[PDB]
Amino acid sequence: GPSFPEPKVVRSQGGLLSLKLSATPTPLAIAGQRATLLTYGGSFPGPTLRVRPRDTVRLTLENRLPEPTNLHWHGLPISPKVDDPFLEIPPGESWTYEFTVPKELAGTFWYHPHLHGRVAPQLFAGLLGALVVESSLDAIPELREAEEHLLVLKDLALQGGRPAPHTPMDWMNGKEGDLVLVNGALRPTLVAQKATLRLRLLNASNARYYRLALQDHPLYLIAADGGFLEEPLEVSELLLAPGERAEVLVRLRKEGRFLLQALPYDRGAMGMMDMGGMAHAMPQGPSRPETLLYLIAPKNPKPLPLPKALSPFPTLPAPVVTRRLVLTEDMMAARFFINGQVFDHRRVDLKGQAQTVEVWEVENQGDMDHPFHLHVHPFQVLSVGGRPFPYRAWKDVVNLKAGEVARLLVPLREKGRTVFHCHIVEHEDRGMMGVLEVG
Numbered sequence: 234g235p236s237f238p239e240p241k242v243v244r245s246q247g248g249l250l251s252l253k254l255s256a257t258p259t260p261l262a263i264a265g266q267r268a269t270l271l272t273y274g275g276s277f278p279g280p281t282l283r284v285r286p287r288d289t290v291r292l293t294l295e296n297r298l299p300e301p302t303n304l305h306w307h308g309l310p311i312s313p314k315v316d317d318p319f320l321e322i323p324p325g326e327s328w329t330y331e332f333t334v335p336k337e338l339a340g341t342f343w344y345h346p347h348l349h350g351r352v353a354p355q356l357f358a359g360l361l362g363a364l365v366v367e368s369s370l371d372a373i374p375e376l377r378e379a380e381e382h383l384l385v386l387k388d389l390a391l392q393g394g395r396p397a398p399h400t401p402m403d404w405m406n407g408k409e410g411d412l413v414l415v416n417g418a419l420r421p422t423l424v425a426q427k428a429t430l431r432l433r434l435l436n437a438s439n440a441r442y443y444r445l446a447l448q449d450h451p452l453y454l455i456a457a458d459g460g461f462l463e464e465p466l467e468v469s470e471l472l473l474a475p476g477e478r479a480e481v482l483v484r485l486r487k488e489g490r491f492l493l494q495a496l497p498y499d500r501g502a503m504g505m506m507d508m509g510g511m512a513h514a515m516p517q518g519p520s521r522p523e524t525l526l527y528l529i530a531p532k533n534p535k536p537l538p539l540p541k542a543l544s545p546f547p548t549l550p551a552p553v554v555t556r557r558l559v560l561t562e563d564m565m566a567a568r569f570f571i572n573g574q575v576f577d578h579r580r581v582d583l584k585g586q587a588q589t590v591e592v593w594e595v596e597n598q599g600d601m602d603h604p605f606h607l608h609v610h611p612f613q614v615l616s617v618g619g620r621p622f623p624y625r626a627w628k629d630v631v632n633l634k635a636g637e638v639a640r641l642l643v644p645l646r647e648k649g650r651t652v653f654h655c656h657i658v659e660h661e662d663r664g665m666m667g668v669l670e671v672g
C-alpha cells in the first residue's frame with residue numbers, strides 16, 4: 234500500500250453520508266503484532282468521514298461490545314439531542330445519528346464514545362475516527378496544490394494481545410502507552426511528493442501530549458480544533474493536548490530525512506515512591522522524546538507561497554455573563570472536581586441563553602495539565618495564563634497548565650442539555666465534568 238498509512242475515507246455522495254458502523258472487538262495486525270482492539274468499521278483508527286457544509290449525515294451505530302456505548306461528534310456544533318452525551322446504546326442494539334453539517338464550518342473533527350465512567354477504557358482500546366469538513370477555502374491554490382495527510386496521534390499499550398487494563402495509577406494520571414503511533418502505525422515513513430504538505434493533526438490519546446516539532450522546520454498553523462485561523466501563524470513547535478486538533482502547512486526546505494518528534498513535555502503526571510518515610514506521590518517529570526514519523530523531502534523542493542489569508546473570524550456580540558469554573562484534584566483518591574463537585578447527570582450546573590455570548594474563566598488549581606472541553610458550543614480562546622492568544626479561531630478544547638486561567642468567549646448555539654469536562658478522559662470518568670443547559 235502507500236508508504237504512509239492513513240485511515241480509509243468515506244465521502245458523502247450527492248450530499249448524503251449514509252453509513253452503518255459496528256463497534257466490535259476486532260483481531261488485527263498493529264505495530265507488527267496481532268492484537269484484538271475495539272474498533273469502528275473493523276479498523277484502527279476508524280474510517281475518516283469526509284463531508285461538506287450542508288451535507289446530511291446518517292450514521293447507524295451498531296453496538297457489538299459487551300457494555301453500552303454511544304457516539305460523541307466531537308467538535309461539531311450540532312444539537313445535543315443528536316450529539317447526546319447521556320444516550321446509552323445497550324449491547325446488541327443500534328442507534329441512528331442524523332444531522333446536517335452546519336453551513337459555516339470547516340476543519341478536522343472526530344468521533345468516539347462518551348458514556349460517563351466508560352470513556353477511558355473504550356477510547357484506549359481503539360474506538361475513535363476522524364471527521365473532516367471540506368471547505369471552499371480548500372480550493373485556493375496554496376492549499377489545493379499542497380499534499381494533504383491526516384495524522385491521528387494515538388498511543389497504546391498491549392498485554393496478552395489486548396489493550397492493557399487500567400491500573401489505579403492510570404485513573405489518577407490518565408493512561409499513556411509505550412506504542413506511540415500515527416494512524417495505528419509505528420513510526421511510518423512519509424515520502425513527500427510535493428514541497429508543501431498540508432497536515433491535519435488529531436490527538437486521540439487518553440492522556441498523552443504531543444509537543445510537536447519537525448527537525449529543521451517551523452510549522453505554519455492554519456486551523457485550530459474547529460476552524461481556520463485568519464492567516465497562517467509560524468510556530469517552532471506545537472503542543473497538542475488530548476482532544477485537540479490542528480492543521481499545519483509544512484514547507485520542505487531541502488532534500489533529506491526529517492524526524493517529526495513529540496518532544497519532552499511534563500504534564501504533571503505522578504508516580505509513587507517510598508524513601509524511608511513517605512509513601513507519597515512524586516512527579517514523573519517530562520515524557521521521553523518520541524519519533525512520530527520519518528519525513529522524506531522530494532528532490533529540489535520549492536514550496537508554494539503561503540496563503541496570505543484564510544478565514545476572517547467573526548467578531549462576536551458583546552457577552553452577557555461571565556462564568557468561573559475552578560478545576561481541582563484529589564490525586565490519591567483519583568477524584569477530580571469542577572467548583573468542588575463531581576459530575577451528576579441529574580444536576581444542571583450552568584444555565585445559559587441560546588444566541589448570547591458568555592465569558593468563561595476556567596482556572597486550573599491542580600498540579601496537572603488539564604485540557605478543558607465543552608461540547609456543542611465552540612469557543613474563542615482570548616488568553617491563557619494571562620497571555621493573550623496569538624490568533625483567532627474556533628476551539629473546543631483548551632489546555633491549562635497548573636495554576637493557569639483560560640478566558641474563553643463562548644457563543645451559545647444549540648438548545649438543550651450538554652456537558653463540559655476534562656479531556657484527560659480518565660479524569661472525566663472520575664468526576665471532572667458538569668452539565669450546561671441552554672434554553
Ligand SMILES: [Hg+2]
Nearest residue numbers: 305307345476
Ligand atoms: Hg472528545
Ligand SMILES: [Hg+2]
Nearest residue numbers: 305318347654
Ligand atoms: Hg465528552
Ligand SMILES: [Hg+2]
Nearest residue numbers: 506508511515
Ligand atoms: Hg518522596
Ligand SMILES: [Hg+2]
Nearest residue numbers: 603655657660
Ligand atoms: Hg483532568
